[PDB]
Amino acid sequence: SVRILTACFLSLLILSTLLGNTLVCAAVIRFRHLRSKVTNFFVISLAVSDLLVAVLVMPWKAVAEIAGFWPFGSFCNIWVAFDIMCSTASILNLCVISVDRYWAISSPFRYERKMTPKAAFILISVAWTLSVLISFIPVQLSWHKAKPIDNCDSSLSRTYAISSSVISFYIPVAIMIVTYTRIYRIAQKQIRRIAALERAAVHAKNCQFKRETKVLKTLSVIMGVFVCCWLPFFILNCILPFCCIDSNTFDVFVWFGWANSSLNPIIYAFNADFRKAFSTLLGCY
Amino acid sequence: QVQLQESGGGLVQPGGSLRLSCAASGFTFSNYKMNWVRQAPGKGLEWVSDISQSGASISYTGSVKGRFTISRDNAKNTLYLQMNSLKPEDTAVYYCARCPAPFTRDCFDVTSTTYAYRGQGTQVTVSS
Amino acid sequence: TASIAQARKLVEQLKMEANIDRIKVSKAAADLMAYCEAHAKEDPLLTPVPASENPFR
Amino acid sequence: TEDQRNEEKAQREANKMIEKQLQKDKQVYRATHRLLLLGADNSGKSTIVKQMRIYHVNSGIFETKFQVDKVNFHMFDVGAQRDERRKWIQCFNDVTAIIFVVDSSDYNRLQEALNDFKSIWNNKWLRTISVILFLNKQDLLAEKVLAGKSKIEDYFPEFARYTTPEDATPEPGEDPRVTRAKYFIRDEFLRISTASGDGRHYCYPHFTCSVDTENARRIFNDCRDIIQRMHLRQYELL
Amino acid sequence: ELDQLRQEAEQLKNQIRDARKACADATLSQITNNIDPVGRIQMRTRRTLRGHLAKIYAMHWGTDSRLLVSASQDGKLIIWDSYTTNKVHAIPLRSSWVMTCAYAPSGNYVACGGLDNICSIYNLKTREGNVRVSRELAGHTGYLSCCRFLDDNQIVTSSGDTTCALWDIETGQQTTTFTGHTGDVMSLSLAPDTRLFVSGACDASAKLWDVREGMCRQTFTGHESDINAICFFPNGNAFATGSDDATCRLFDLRADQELMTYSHDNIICGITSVSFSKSGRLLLAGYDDFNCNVWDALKADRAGVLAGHDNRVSCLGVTDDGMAVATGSWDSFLKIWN
Ligand SMILES: C[C@H]1c2cccc(CCC(C)(C)O)c2C[C@H](CO)N1C(=O)Cc1c(Cl)cccc1Cl
Ligand SMILES: CC(C)CCC[C@@H](C)[C@H]1CC[C@H]2[C@@H]3CC=C4C[C@@H](O)CC[C@]4(C)[C@H]3CC[C@]12C
Ligand SMILES: CC(C)CCC[C@@H](C)[C@H]1CC[C@H]2[C@@H]3CC=C4C[C@@H](O)CC[C@]4(C)[C@H]3CC[C@]12C
Ligand SMILES: CC(C)CCC[C@@H](C)[C@H]1CC[C@H]2[C@@H]3CC=C4C[C@@H](O)CC[C@]4(C)[C@H]3CC[C@]12C
Ligand SMILES: CC(C)CCC[C@@H](C)[C@H]1CC[C@H]2[C@@H]3CC=C4C[C@@H](O)CC[C@]4(C)[C@H]3CC[C@]12C
Ligand SMILES: CC(C)CCC[C@@H](C)[C@H]1CC[C@H]2[C@@H]3CC=C4C[C@@H](O)CC[C@]4(C)[C@H]3CC[C@]12C
Ligand SMILES: CCCCCCCCCCCCCCCC(=O)O
Ligand SMILES: CCCCCCCCCCCCCCCC(=O)O
Ligand SMILES: CCCCCCCCCCCCCCCC(=O)O
Ligand SMILES: CCCCCCCCCCCCCCCC(=O)O
Ligand SMILES: NCCc1ccc(O)c(O)c1
């Protein structure tokens, strides 16, 4: 009854995430100018991380939810490690991009000299190594599992729930709130300078708010979509072991976290070069 | 061959009226922005005024603003300049000038060292 | 006397340019066609080239 | 076919040596910020930046090198060329900014400067580049107004009906009459720049003079504005 | 004085236009109606040469169709190898602003010009192995626009001060000076016989210059705007010209008037560089709207469209055997099209 309807939404979600991430990766490989800018290196890392979710994390959980049981019980221990890795890799890549956008807009001269492509890789490599240091070591040593029809009910322990959340969510969202607030200080000042020149012109011609909405809309869409998806799941994730929260309800919030991986390409690849690349590659226009 | 032929002028009186006829031959007249340029005796070239392709945007020089009408007929292929309320200090030779590129808004035609898209000009003397 | 010494050179120029021989358009036309027909097979851009003959493929 | 393989090794080795050199130069090239100096003959475009004054001399072109806060600037002053400039200006699209210097002392030749600025602003390849504006010889403007004969109101009828902008901040040791004249010149250049409404490039007005040390810092600061607006537009923030 | 000269000058120009209209029996496109069309010509990017920093303004092939010189605004003159994508030489230039580059028919020298109004010849057969300035020529006043080798001894240059010179490389002086043009002379195209050349200036008039005599023979006044590039038809009896009014035109040295005009209503952008093919059937034109159109020289219909560049196609070259077509644009990449 309600399984038919639910199956369609989950299948569209997987296909949407697969579609967008594939197009972003293909477009950057098949165009050199999308590889000359050092900024677009990070969007490659964010398209690979988001594509590992759709390929390897989303289907198995979807199959288990529709069917009700867990098909292969040994694969549950391995799945958890890839679930932690693919989520943390997505959130850390979104922190690297903000730090990239704050280096270029604050100090534009130093950003040309210091940002070698060499150092670009060093940012990407600390992100992906933190993801494997948080996931494959504790889950296989089973620090989280020993808290005191087969199910994959991985109840995280007290130690590992708090610790993983701080290194994967709370630190990168502390960096991102301080980052984008400063970029909204810089952008606001520039509009004031334009408004001074504009109004003198208007005053001279007569004697003879739209820009500010754009500044606030762009930053709101980036911060708003990311926070709304992951905040009602990391609040619950810290509470749940300490604790209430039903299993059905908690399940629903996991999908909202994963849904952010579907909306990540459209938010960051609505640029002039990317849109031109999309029309060519897909062949629509 | 791009050719410009000015017409009208001669010895006139201050405060009178004068129409300058400009004949543009050898090109498509509606594609190019066109403008007026004059040369005082013992002085340099100065940009009088301009008119666009359709004829909407019209700007003038400040010191002669509100004193000259610029008509640009597309079908007749003629550029008219109406000169009323003349001044004895405003006596010069008037050269038709054409901006070198079509469908553009940038113009480089104040060059005195043999600009080759202008006419031979007409002598317009005002004697008080 | 500089403007009349450049006018004079234009007059002398146009006298030497008027007095030239002029071939008709239709004979000229046929010569152009003759050179494009004869050398039509020797053009690697007009006629495609196999990959073994092509040094770029 | 063994000799052919040996020949390929020679060319490949040569290519690697040349390629590594082009990478060292690539670092120096990116760090280099180009600047084009455009100005009238009467106005002191050479007098703009006395901070470093390396002033290398070529046959026609003049290049000035000056560093501010360990950032190297090259400023290319075009010298002995023909009066028509609609063909060699296409070369200079790759520069970071175009410095435009005008003389406000002569009101009759001011109109010519406005036409030159309008042509540069409306030029298709100069659409990306911002223009940095210097209104030279301000001290002469003060002394000239005291004569009693207003030249500007003859050449400009708009200045008989004009008020001082409230956004402008006058210097304390200046005549209010002179300050009206300064901003009204400034507004002329901004009216050409606001008419287009491109949004890709802007016009930065400055009140320089003949004896100014601060001009090197000004061109440094306006460079910071040009590259920040570039990144902001790229992420569609502005 | 000035009025009788200009009236005589006007009666001479009416005689020339009577001559040109008496000779005009028919047009080329009427004659060529019983000609099989070329059809769609599709070319693909066989090679991309990468390694430039600034925009590539001009380039010139070799006589063996192997090595091309490319000139860029970063101050680097890079001799490429077209087959293996290897940089066989890279030359650091004194002036960063370069507007032309030439390759010798023997392959021994390369010349470059620019805004420093000096043609610099570089030797490539130095026993030390390092490239060095062989001589510098500082005669002209305006900028240097196009320069081409007649041989290893005489080079012809196109300045920006309405003057074309004939340089001797050994003595370092000007042999013959051509002062006929009134506008800025943009480019010159040497004849295959190397006895004549043609230059298109910014006065919308192409001239036919004799090298040994020293005076122009013919004037062509068919255009409406600045003539950007000029190229001979491969028999030496015709040339093509590209202007800013989006119209290519074909001119005859015998009929002394325009044969055909290549215009289309959708494209109003300028024409940077035009090169014929080997046979002369395809006219290749580098337009300002980021792509190249392959016009048919006898039918005035676009075969095909080379849309591979990101910025405007600055210059266009064709090998002497017609094997490939290289275009350089202002995105710093050299696409080889076949
Ligand atoms: C790009 C970043 C970086 C990021 C990661 C790694 C390295 C070291 C790479 C090495 C030189 C060892 O090869 C570096 C260089 C250096 C760190 O020293 N830089 C930065 O200054 C970042 C930065 C700041 Cl703080 C402020 C304004 C602009 C910029 Cl860009
Ligand atoms: C690409 C998307 C559309 C695929 C969606 C697959 C959906 C439509 C399929 C997959 C599993 C299927 C269900 C499998 C089993 C049953 C039990 C049967 O007694 C009623 C139909 C029902 C409930 C099927 C309905 C259709 C179903 C839900
Ligand atoms: C947990 C954190 C601290 C681990 C950091 C590991 C760092 C030191 C290691 C792991 C991956 C390594 C990078 C791997 C690949 C490259 C590309 C190469 O062309 C330059 C060196 C560079 C960029 C290495 C630099 C050092 C590096 C970034
Ligand atoms: C950068 C990526 C490739 C690093 C991956 C490291 C993986 C392959 C390593 C690091 C930690 C290792 C685990 C450490 C401890 C154990 C417990 C032992 O009784 C079985 C093997 C097992 C489970 C190891 C399997 C392999 C392992 C998971
Ligand atoms: C920046 C990184 C290193 C911070 C990591 C903080 C971790 C190591 C700290 C912070 C919160 C701590 C937990 C707080 C509360 C409890 C409940 C107690 O009955 C057992 C220990 C336990 C479970 C702690 C284990 C260690 C812990 C998880
Ligand atoms: C989970 C996803 C769908 C959440 C997306 C939230 C987006 C669409 C909403 C939430 C916050 C909203 C913004 C809030 C405030 C303003 C300022 C107002 O003067 C213009 C609209 C604007 C800019 C809104 C645009 C739409 C907006 C950005
Ligand atoms: C246990 C599995 C771990 C998988 C880790 C995958 C990490 C992929 C990182 C890709 C970085 C790409 C950076 C840009 C490269 C480029 O220049 O195109
Ligand atoms: C490209 C990514 C695809 C991911 C595919 C994951 C496959 C997991 C397979 C799970 C079942 C394994 C059965 C093992 C049989 C056994 O020894 O018991
Ligand atoms: C590079 C990443 C690849 C990921 C592939 C994951 C596949 C996991 C399969 C686990 C099989 C475990 C079988 C155990 C059988 C047993 O109980 O003894
Ligand atoms: C604009 C963002 C849209 C995001 C869409 C996310 C869809 C998630 C769907 C999850 C369905 C989970 C059903 C659980 C049923 C239950 O309570 O047992
Ligand atoms: N579906 C995401 C599950 C997840 C991801 C990262 C974490 O740190 C964590 O505790 C839990």
Author numbering:
A (entry chain R): 21 to 168, 183 to 242, 264 to 298, 307 to 348
B (entry chain N): 1 to 128
C (entry chain G): 6 to 62
D (entry chain A): 9 to 246
E (entry chain B): 3 to 340
Sentences reproduced from the published study:
Dopamine acts as an essential neurotransmitter whose signaling is conducted through five G protein-coupled receptors (GPCRs), dopamine D1 to D5 receptors (DRD1–DRD5).1 The D1-like receptors, comprising DRD1 and DRD5, primarily couple to the Gs family of G proteins to activate adenylyl cyclase and induce cAMP production. DRD1 is the most abundantly expressed dopamine receptor in the CNS. It is the central receptor mediating excitatory dopamine signaling in multiple dopaminergic pathways. Here, we report two structures of DRD1–Gs complexes activated by the endogenous ligand, dopamine, and a synthetic agonist, SKF81297, both in the presence of LY3154207, respectively.
